[PDB]
Design a protein around this ligand. Structure first.
Ligand SMILES: COCCCCCCCCCN1C[C@H](O)[C@@H](O)[C@H](O)[C@H]1CO
Length: 765
């Protein structure tokens, strides 16, 4: 029944619009298979279309905004795109229709409406691009009846081992098709839907834009060769309309030109399912998905006061739908330096120069292929898996669909190597690499990232202790299924725990250091003079200079998180020998947090280093790092230390801004310096941890119950209102928020952990 829920999950999740790096496209969760993507652009001249055409996600002045209004990867959703450059409001609806043995069928409607500013007679070129990777597979456009192209629907018939037999239809659509009265129309037709069927080596099929443009370019060269010239030139839209040549191939380009508003459907029919999908099915299934989305949201994300209003509901739906709508499937090789050069041990003073020397050996090589099914922080800027981000992403997603979240956790853990390492940043395949300067592709087996995926596991454990409907909660509702999941995952968690303690160990013994335990002390590897990228808090101030004797209190707290999880999970699996070891580790971290990291003088936790005179010194920089044992749930609710931490949190002159907690205190010497990334701005992920911890203390007997209640109430409100106000005014989630002005800044479309706001509004932690 665990093998069974698994198969049912696989079949349900197989198809999706799982290409968030592009405006709209589909692919199944199979490395080498059938992919689609949409392109569009206005054409006003002989040279403009190359600049107007849209394919991969971006954000600039030419794009008002875009995103998912509604989304559930089992059912589908509706995306809306507000394109200024192209004077178009576009809607792409996607729906899955279960049936057969190959993961079912799906349909999409593409709808374009010119905005008020666009010329009423705008010509827009629209391309549906279809590619198929695999050695023993086939795809063929059924030729037209007409001589120059298609009056009606374009049918592609194809087959592969993975998908069996299928048909993909691009429907005729609705809208004016311009007609050219030029001489060229005698050889090219007056204007109609066209299809080119081509083949390239599999590994380049993702390059849809260059491949399209190469075909457009060949058509223009034919014009020149055949005496079509500036003395009497065809209209632009006809110059850029491909000559029809349907056939067999692994690439099929379907092109339409419309004048004014337009729409057309894409109908994927899995043959093994029986009756093929129609446009009427699409409409019915689209209405039904919306109804189901609506019912689930109201239930799962029941927004509490003072955010019960309709405005907050629309806001929460946008934030949530963009988070879960970012889910992608990525496949291909990763770039990894497997030299384990000794310079990477960072055991000496000045280690960063040595590590630079090793990296300059460039021993990195491609390995894999790997796959990953994950949500992402940023469609336009970094559409790929980041390890500690995903832990936050899955917190609202798990509420919605725990089986989906567990599927993503599993996907991430399947990347763990033999030592216990998962690369913190997952750049899988040439397509993912295209978006990443080469200097930034290499992953390093000594670089960690916070184990926030344990927080998701913690939530599932609590739920376990206490057809698409059934599927989403099968792993909690059948306790047998849940436990088997944990049983199979558990050794990997254990392995990652051991990996942290082996590779990210700090040095107690070599120095004049005294502490309850000789073992518990941690130091993030990979730090440079101005950064610590592995911790997640890029440029938060750390001991200067970096030093092999540094200890990082956030890292110790994360190990605290993992060991607590391993206690709950080990206990469920009856790993008595394991649970006893974990229990002594936790006790030791509890003591060493105080012994190595507590500053009585400052009233907070601090990272530690080793002096010019070889002595332990605390280095205090009041901000998120200072709060870490509190943020990660490690302190007792009557701890006097927790009480001082609450004072720091609520202190307006330190961390407390009207817009949320500042990443660094206004009193710190490093406040608003350098790139000022984590040196003052309000970040939603850390604020979320604070809010959740305040609520815990607020809902429990103790001396700080009422302080916590007040801070909970205000912080929740301040964070939610800041994200809402910015969303209302800009249409975006932002990466971080200015604590002086309240403005969203850095990158837009950050959904992304900013989307945690849905769960903050929902409350009842
Ligand atoms: C150098 O430039 C070339 C590469 C550019 C792309 C860099 C990837 C963007 C990272 C964004 N972001 C920075 C946060 O401090 C991290 O905590 C967070 O995990 C990460 C992902 O959301």
């Amino acid at each position: 029944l665990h093998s069974e829920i698994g198969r049912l999950n696989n079949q349900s999740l197989l198809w999706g619009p799982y290409r968030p790096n592009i405006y709209f496209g589909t692919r199944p969760r199979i490395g080498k298979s059938l992919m689609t993507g949409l392109m569009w652009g206005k054409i006003e001249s002989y040279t403009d279309f190359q600049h107007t055409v849209r394919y991969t996600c971006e954000q600039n002045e030419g794009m008002k905004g875009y995103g998912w209004d509604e989304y559930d990867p089992r059912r589908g959703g509706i995306q809306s795109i507000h394109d200024i450059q192209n004077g178009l409001d576009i809607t792409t609806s996607f729906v899955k229709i279960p049936g057969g043995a190959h993961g079912g069928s799906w349909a999409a409607r593409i709808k374009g409406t010119l905005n008020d500013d666009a010329p009423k007679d705008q010509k827009t070129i629209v391309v549906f691009y279809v590619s198929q990777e695999g050695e023993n597979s086939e795809l063929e456009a059924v030729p037209s009846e007409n001589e120059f192209g298609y009056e009606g629907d374009v049918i592609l018939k194809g087959r592969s081992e993975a998908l069996g037999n299928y048909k993909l239809v691009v429907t005729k659509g609705k809208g004016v098709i311009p007609q050219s009265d030029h001489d060229l129309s005698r050889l090219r037709g007056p204007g109609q839907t066209v299809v080119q069927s081509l083949t390239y080596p599999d590994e380049v099929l993702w390059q849809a834009k260059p491949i399209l443009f190469q075909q457009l370019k060949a058509g223009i060269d034919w014009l020149v060769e055949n005496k079509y010239d500036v003395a009497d030139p065809p209209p632009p839209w006809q110059v850029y309309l491909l000559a029809n040549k349907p056939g067999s191939g692994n690439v099929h380009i379907v092109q339409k030109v419309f004048e004014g508003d337009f729409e057309f459907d894409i109908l994927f029919s899995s043959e093994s399912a029986g009756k093929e999908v129609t446009s009427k099915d699409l409409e019915r299934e689209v209405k039904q998905a919306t109804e189901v989305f609506g019912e689930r949201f109201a239930r799962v994300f029941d927004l509490k006061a003072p955010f019960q209003g309709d405005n907050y509901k629309k806001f929460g739906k946008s934030m949530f739908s963009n988070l879960i709508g970012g889910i992608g499937y990525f496949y291909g090789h990763s770039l990894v330096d497997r030299s384990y050069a000794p310079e990477y041990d960072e055991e000496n003073e000045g280690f960063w120069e040595d590590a630079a020397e090793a990296r300059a050996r460039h021993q990195e090589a491609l390995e894999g292929p790997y796959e990953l099914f994950t949500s992402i922080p940023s469609r336009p800027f970094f559409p790929r898996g980041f390890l500690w981000d995903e832990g936050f992403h899955l917190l609202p997603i798990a509420d919605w669909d725990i089986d989906l979240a567990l599927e993503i956790i599993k996907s991430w853990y399947n990347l763990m190597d033999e030592d216990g390492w998962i690369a913190r940043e997952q750049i899988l395949g040439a397509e993912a690499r295209s978006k990443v300067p080469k200097e930034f592709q290499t992953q390093y087996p000594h670089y960690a990232n916070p184990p926030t995926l344990f927080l998701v596991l913690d939530n599932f454990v609590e739920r376990l202790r206490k057809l698409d409907e059934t599927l989403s909660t099968a792993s909690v509702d059948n306790p047998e299924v849940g436990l088997e999941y944990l049983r199979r995952l558990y050794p990997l968690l254990r392995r990652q725990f051991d990996w942290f303690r082996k590779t990210q160990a700090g040095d107690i013994k070599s120095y004049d250091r005294e502490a309850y335990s000789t073992k518990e002390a941690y130091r993030w590897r990979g730090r440079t003079v101005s950064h610590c990228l592995t911790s997640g808090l890029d440029d938060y101030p750390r001991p200067q200079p970096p030093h092999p004797g540094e200890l990082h209190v956030d890292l110790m707290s994360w190990v605290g998180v993992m060991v607590k999880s391993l206690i709950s999970i080990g206990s469920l699996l009856g790993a008595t020998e394991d649970v006893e070891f974990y229990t002594k580790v936790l006790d030791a971290i509890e003591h060493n947090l105080d012994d190595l990291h507590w500053s009585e003088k400052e009233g907070c936790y601090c990272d530690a280093t080793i002096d010019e005179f070889e002595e332990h010194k605390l280095v205090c920089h009041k901000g998120y790092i200072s709060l870490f044992p509190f943020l990660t749930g490690l302190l007792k609710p009557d701890s006097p230390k927790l009480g001082k931490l609450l004072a720091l949190i609520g202190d307006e002159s330190e961390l407390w801004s009207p817009y949320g907690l500042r990443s660094l205190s206004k009193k710190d010497e490093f406040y608003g310096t350098a790139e000022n990334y984590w040196r003052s701005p309000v970040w939603i992920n850390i604020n979320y941890l604070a809010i959740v911890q305040l609520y815990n203390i607020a809902t429990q007997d103790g001396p700080y119950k009422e302080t916590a209640r007040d801070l909970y109430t205000r912080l929740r409100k301040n964070i939610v209102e800041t994200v809402y106000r910015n969303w209302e005014e800009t249409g975006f989630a932002w990466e971080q928020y200015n604590p002086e002005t309240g403005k969203g800044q850095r990158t837009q479309h950050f959904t992304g952990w900013t989307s945690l706001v849905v769960k903050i509004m929902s409350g009842h932690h």
